[PDB]
Amino acid sequence: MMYVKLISSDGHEFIVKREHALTSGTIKAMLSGNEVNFREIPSHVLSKVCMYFTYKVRYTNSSTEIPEFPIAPEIALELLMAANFLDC
Amino acid sequence: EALAXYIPMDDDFQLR
Amino acid sequence: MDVFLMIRRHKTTIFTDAKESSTVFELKRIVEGILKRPPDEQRLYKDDQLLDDGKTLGECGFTSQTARPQAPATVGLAFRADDTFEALCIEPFSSPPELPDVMK
Amino acid sequence: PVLRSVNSREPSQVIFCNRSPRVVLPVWLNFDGEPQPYPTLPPGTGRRIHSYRGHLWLFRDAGTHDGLLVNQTELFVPSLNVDGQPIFANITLPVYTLKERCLQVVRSLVKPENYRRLDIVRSLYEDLEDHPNVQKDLERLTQERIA
Numbered sequence A: 001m002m003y004v005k006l007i008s009s010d011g012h013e014f015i016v017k018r019e020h021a022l023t024s025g026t027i028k029a030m031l032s033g034n035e036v037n038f039r040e041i042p043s044h045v046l047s048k049v050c051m052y053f054t055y056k057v058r059y060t061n062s063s064t065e066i067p068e069f070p071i072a073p074e075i076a077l078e079l080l081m082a083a084n085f086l087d088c
Numbered sequence B: 001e002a003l004a005x006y007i008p009m010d011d012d013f014q015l016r
Numbered sequence C: 001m002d003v004f005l006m007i008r009r010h011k012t013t014i015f016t017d018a019k020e021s022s023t024v025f026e027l028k029r030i031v032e033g034i035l036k037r038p039p040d041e042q043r044l045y046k047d048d049q050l051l052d053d054g055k056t057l058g059e060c061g062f063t064s065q066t067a068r069p070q071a072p073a074t075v076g077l078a079f080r081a082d083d084t085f086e087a088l089c090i091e092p093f094s095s096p097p098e099l100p101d102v103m104k
Numbered sequence D: 001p002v003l004r005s006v007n008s009r010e011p012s013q014v015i016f017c018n019r020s021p022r023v024v025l026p027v028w029l030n031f032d033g034e035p036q037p038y039p040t041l042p043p044g045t046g047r048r049i050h051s052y053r054g055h056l057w058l059f060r061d062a063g064t065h066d067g068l069l070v071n072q073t074e075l076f077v078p079s080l081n082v083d084g085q086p087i088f089a090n091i092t093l094p095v096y097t098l099k100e101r102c103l104q105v106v107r108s109l110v111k112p113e114n115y116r117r118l119d120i121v122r123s124l125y126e127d128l129e130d131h132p133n134v135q136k137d138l139e140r141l142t143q144e145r146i147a
Helices: A025-030 A043-059 A072-088 C024-035 D098-109 D112-117 D123-129 D132-146
Strands: A003-007 A012-019 A036-037 C002-009 C012-021 C042-046 C075-078 D011-019 D024-029 D035-037 D047-050 D056-061 D085-093
Touching: A012 A043, A043 A072, A043 C012, A043 D035, A043 D098, A072 D098, A072 D123, C002 C024, C012 C024, C024 C042, D011 D024, D035 D132, D047 D085, D056 D085, D085 D123, D098 D123, D112 D123
Parallel strands: A003 A036, A012 C012, C002 C075, D011 D085
Antiparallel strands: A003 A012, C002 C012, C042 C075, D011 D047, D024 D035, D024 D056
C-alpha cells in the first residue's frame, strides 16, 4: 500500500493513501510521471481536505445513502480556496 | 387527454 | 464494514481505514509499514484508554456508524523507549480566523 | 424537446424516498419539456405518487436547486408496475466536488450582494454567482444525450 505525505503551513504532516490523494487533480498531475509541500494550507484546512479524499473514494459509484460532507462556516472560505487550488 | 402526475391523500412515512 | 481513522502522534496524522473485525494488532502492522516501529513498540489509544492488541476495533468502540470517511475517529499513538516513558501527545491543528461579518 | 414526458396515460405507482439530508423538490418535465414543481419532501421521508409510464422526473434541493440523484442517475422514468409493486425513486446526494460543496456553504451564509466583500481569489466571485439552475442543467443533459 503506497502512501504520500502532505505538509501543512504549520508543519503538521498528513499521511494518506496515494490512491486517495489522486482525488486532487493537482496532486494527480504532480505524481503522474512521496512528500508534497502545501505550506500555503493550514492544518485545520488540510485535515478536512484529506477527509474529503476518503469520502470521495468511498462514496463515488456507491448505491447507498451518501452522507453530507460537513463544513463549518468558519473554515468555508479557506477550504474553498484550498479546493480550488487542489482541483477537487 | 393529457394526464399529469398527482399525489393521493395519504400520510408520508419515515425512512430508516 | 470499515472504520475510518486518523492515527495521530505529535504532528503526524495517518488517514487509514480498517475492517471493524480487524484487531488492534493488525492496525499496529499498518502503522509499522508507515512509521517503521514494530507493534511491540507502539501504544494505541481511544481517548485515554490503551487498546489491547487482541481486541477488534469494534470491541474497542470503533464502529462504522461513528468512524466515517468524512468524520474519522481519532486513534492516539505513542512509541516506547528503552528507559523513558513517552506521554501520549497529539498537537492540535491550527485555528480558523473570525467568521466574516457578511457570513454572520 | 428531447427531454419530455410522454402522454402515455398508463398509471404507474411510484414511491419517492428522500434519502438525503435536504428538503427535496421533485420536478416533473411536462409534455413540452417544461419543468414543473411538485410538493417537496422533508429529509428522511417517503411519499406515494400516482405517476405515469414514460413521465420524466428530476430532483433538486428545494431552497438552493443543488443537483440530486435518483437511483444514482440524473432522471427518473416510471415503468409499468410488476405484480402491483410500486417503483422506488431513491433520492440521494451526489458526491459533490469539494469546490462545489464549499460554494454551497458560502452561498447559504452570504447574501449575493455581499459575495464580492469576501476575501477570496477573484475567480471565485463568478463561481459563487453562477448558482445551480434547472434550465441550464436541462440544456446540459440535452447536449449529453445528443452526443
